[PDB]
Design a protein around this ligand. Structure first.
Ligand SMILES: CC(C)n1ncnc1-c1cc2c(s1)-c1ccc(C(N)=O)cc1OCC2
Length: 828
């Protein structure tokens, strides 16, 4: 079992057994505490269904997907070695009903993929079947024996103390101070509880040197009994803010913090990193702080109702005044009747007062309206952010998450994993929920692994917490997945080495081309594993490389264009699997944007609208390094303009429509490509403006030979969005004109915009969370408050329609002005 821990450490990228960077047993208690829910999920899941992981959705089949089916008949081609027979199938027919219709144990598995069609669910309720219908692809399956479930085998009093809390600041120690000579420094100790300061105490500004002592006893205005569970002693250093460290006043065992503490401090408003209980690991270079500390038990009038209702109606970013807070609390039993009032009501609570917390806990016990109400993701996500530090408030949100089908868990997984950063303690209801859903489904578990792993590799603030959560997962997923992750980690480690070695060696010379091909030759010849699962697509199995097709892309960060043969021999097409390995940009920023685009698609699915978005695979694997999916038969918009006019930016309107006519053979395929372009442009115009990533150079915008348009490279981040005259010519418009396709485009854009406006609260919370956990540069109140204006908060459907149509005209009025200005900066 000693070699097993060594295996886990290699799969995590962090040692959970290491106690070099702790001042308490929280992580070890969490490791022990997670054993119970781990073994509780392993010994409760269906062993057969877990091995086959049926990717199913209980959501209704949309209006656009029903029109594709003929006489309630879906053709599915079943394969037997060489022979194949197409069968007429009803959408309501279960996989078992189709099997009895074939012969008149064996399971139906997709050709080329490790995706199975099992379970008591209709054929139309499968995610692969819905994908085939959307792309107009034919359903091909191979009849083979189900996988052995034996392969997934798993290895066997505080309220008695009226004293006003005090902290002794002994002093600060830094080995080497920066060259800036000379400034003054003071210690700012704050008692926080969900980004809310309960009390603040500063020190006398002494000069900044390698050693600064104080011995100062800082007494706070808050009593020891009034300190809540999850409150943080935030120790800061100002000149302005340079060093920070946090300490949980109440431990994981409900005890008040007592003793001597030497904490190593992080260097430099809404950032998730400023909340961490973890100290800086680099003890030989980081600023230190010495402190001294010397068990917690478990009818309204008309005008006022209108006031309370107007408060509940406001957006999540709308600030609450003292009057608003006092009203929500006085009428807390009326506020409990409205589930949308819960975030605002729980922000109105005076957490620094015991009696109020007790009354809040009494209020939370009266949960009946909350338990019965329909799950609102945006509302549930609101209670899991930086503004909520109470485990009872946070648990009622985790309670509502339990009703999410494995389909929707995948939609919000990244953001739920990022929400763990807002948890005061390592062991939390949300951490246990992710673990439970990760062991219940192989797909969620695979994605959870990479989501946690991406954070362990490039975040010292949260690497310890996530390493415990991952170790807990890896100790219950099974040896089948354990070996798969081993093969995936091995290939990634080997390929990342080559990416940086090649980058060290503007133009792509013949020397570097042969060097990469030689490096890949040495790796394929007895070193690289024969087969590995694609991190961005668990179904797809990659095998041997295609060294001939392998190259180094003509980009400033020298990315590796890699092509692999499909390891699955039952594969239909002989098309290679394409992966891009890149270093230099934060791919976590691309992971977040792309997952939001997948959320935006599912939002449009509820309104039965299909905006042809292309949220390609992108997984962050390490520090500034990760992988991308190669979208087959696609080119850059700038590259299409470079065919006619290369070196210069004399952009011609006709080029795009000529490129589509060239790549599409039949005239019907051209109209189908223009039809795909009409929807894809519409979706990407709305999605980009809402997120405020509209202003882009056409080098970062792509199109497929099938007509599908898509934005790329979000690692970087005037016009509201990108609507150029060349895009408008495909529609059939030039200058001040109209077209049957432009009239269509304007109608779909407005349909898409107002469809997202129904899920305003969801988008606002997902965006607010994105800027805190994934954007270390965009951490201001004004940065988050952009989404409100973009989505037109508190506006009529007519005004909002008119607002977006004006943004369309701004792009028409500018035309090429923005792209031409982009050409004078990025290119030259
Ligand atoms: C600058 C590149 C490496 N980058 N940084 C973030 N995302 C990307 C890319 C995404 C995609 C790219 S590059 C792409 C480029 C060319 C082809 C192609 N077919 O030539 C296919 C591609 O995959 C789709 C997304």
């Amino acid at each position: 079992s000693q070699a097993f821990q060594r295996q886990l450490t290699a799969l995590i990228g962090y040692d959970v057994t290491d106690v070099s960077n702790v001042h308490d047993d929280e992580l070890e208690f969490t490791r022990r505490g997670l054993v119970t829910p781990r073994m509780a999920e392993v010994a409760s899941r269906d062993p057969k269904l877990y091995a086959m992981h049926p990717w199913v959705t209980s959501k209704p089949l949309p209006e656009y997907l029903w029109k594709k089916i003929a006489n309630n008949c879906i053709f599915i081609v079943i394969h037997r070695s060489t022979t194949s027979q197409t069968i007429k199938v009803s959408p309501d027919d279960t996989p078992g009903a189709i099997l009895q219709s074939f012969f008149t144990d064996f399971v139906l598995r997709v050709c080329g993929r490790d995706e199975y069609l099992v379970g008591e669910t209709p054929i139309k309720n499968f995610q692969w079947v819905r994908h085939c219908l959307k792309n107009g692809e034919e359903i091909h399956v191979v009849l083979d024996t189900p996988p052995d479930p034996a392969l997934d085998e798993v290895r066997k009093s505080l309220w008695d103390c009226d004293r006003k809390f005090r902290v002794k600041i002994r002093g600060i120690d830094i080995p080497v101070l920066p060259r800036n000579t000379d400034l003054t420094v003071f210690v700012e100790a704050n008692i926080q509880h969900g980004q809310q300061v309960l009390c603040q105490r500063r020190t006398s500004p002494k000069p900044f040197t390698e050693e600064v002592l104080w011995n100062v006893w800082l007494e706070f205005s808050i009593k020891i009994k009034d300190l809540p569970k999850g409150a943080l002693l935030n120790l800061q250093i100002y000149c302005q803010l340079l060093y920070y460290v946090n300490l949980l006043l109440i431990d994981h065992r409900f005890l008040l913090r007592r003793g001597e503490y030497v904490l190593h401090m992080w260097q430099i408003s809404f950032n998730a990193d400023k909340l961490t209980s973890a100290t800086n690991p680099d003890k030989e270079n980081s600023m230190s702080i010495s402190i001294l500390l010397d068990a917690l038990p478990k009818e309204m009038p008309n005008q006022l109702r209108k006031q309370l209702e107007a408060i509940i109606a406001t957006d999540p970013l709308n600030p609450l005044t003292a009057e608003d807070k006092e009203l929500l609390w006085h009428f807390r039993y009326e506020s409990l009747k409205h589930p949308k009032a819960y975030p605002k009501l729980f922000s109105s609570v005076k957490w620094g007062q015991q009696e109020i917390v007790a009354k809040t806990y009494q209020l939370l016990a009266r949960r009946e309206v909350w338990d019965q109400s329909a799950l609102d993701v945006g509302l549930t996500m609101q209670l899991l952010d930086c503004n909520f530090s109470d485990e009872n408030v946070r648990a009622i949100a985790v309670q509502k998450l339990e009703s999410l089908e494995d389909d929707d868990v995948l939609h919000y997984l990244l953001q739920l994993v990022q929400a763990v950063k807002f948890e005061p303690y390592h062991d939390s209801a949300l951490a246990r929920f992710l673990l439970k859903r990760g062991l219940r489904n192989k797909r969620i578990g695979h994605f959870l692994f990479w989501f946690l792993r991406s954070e362990i590799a490039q975040s010292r603030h949260y690497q310890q917490r996530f390493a415990v959560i991952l170790e807990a997962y890896l100790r219950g997923c099974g040896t089948a997945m354990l070996h798969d992750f081993t093969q995936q980690v091995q290939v990634i480690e080997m390929l990342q080495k080559v990416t940086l070695d090649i980058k060290s060696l503007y133009d792509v010379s013949s020397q570097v081309i042969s060097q990469l091909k030689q490096k890949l030759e040495n790796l394929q010849n007895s070193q690289l594993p024969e087969s590995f699962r694609v991190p961005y697509d668990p179904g797809l199995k990659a095998g041997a490389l295609a060294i001939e097709k392998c190259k180094v892309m003509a980009s400033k960060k020298k990315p590796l264009w890699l092509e692999f043969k499909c390891a699955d021999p039952t594969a239909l097409s002989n098309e290679t699997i394409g992966i891009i390995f890149k270093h230099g940009d934060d791919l976590r920023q691309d992971m977040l944007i792309l997952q939001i685009l997948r959320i935006m698609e599912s939002i449009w699915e509820t309104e039965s609208l299909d905006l042809c978005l292309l949220p390609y695979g992108c997984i962050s694997t390490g520090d500034k390094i990760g992988m991308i999916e190669i979208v087959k038969d696609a080119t850059t918009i700038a590259k299409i303009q470079q065919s006619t006019v290369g070196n210069t930016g004399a952009f011609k309107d006709e080029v795009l429509n000529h490129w589509l006519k060239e790549k599409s053979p039949t005239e019907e395929k051209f109209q189908a490509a223009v039809e795909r372009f009409v929807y894809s442009c519409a979706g990407y115009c709305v999605a980009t403006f809402v997120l405020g990533i509209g202003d882009r150079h056409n080098d970062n915008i792509m199109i497929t030979e099938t007509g599908n348009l898509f934005h790329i490279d979000f690692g970087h981040i005037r016009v509201p969005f990108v609507l150029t005259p060349d895009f408008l010519f495909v529609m059939g418009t030039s200058g001040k004109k109209t077209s049957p396709h432009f009239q269509k485009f304007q109608d779909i854009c407005v349909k898409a915009y107002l469809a997202l406006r129904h899920h305003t609260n969801l988008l606002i919370i997902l965006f607010s969370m994105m800027l805190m956990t994934g954007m270390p540069q965009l951490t201001s109140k004004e940065d988050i408050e952009y989404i409100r204006d973009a989505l037109t908060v508190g506006k009529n459907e007519e005004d909002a329609k008119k607002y977006f149509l004006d943004q369309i005209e701004v792009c028409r009025d500018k035309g090429w002005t923005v792209q031409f200005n982009w050409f004078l900066h990025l290119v030259l």
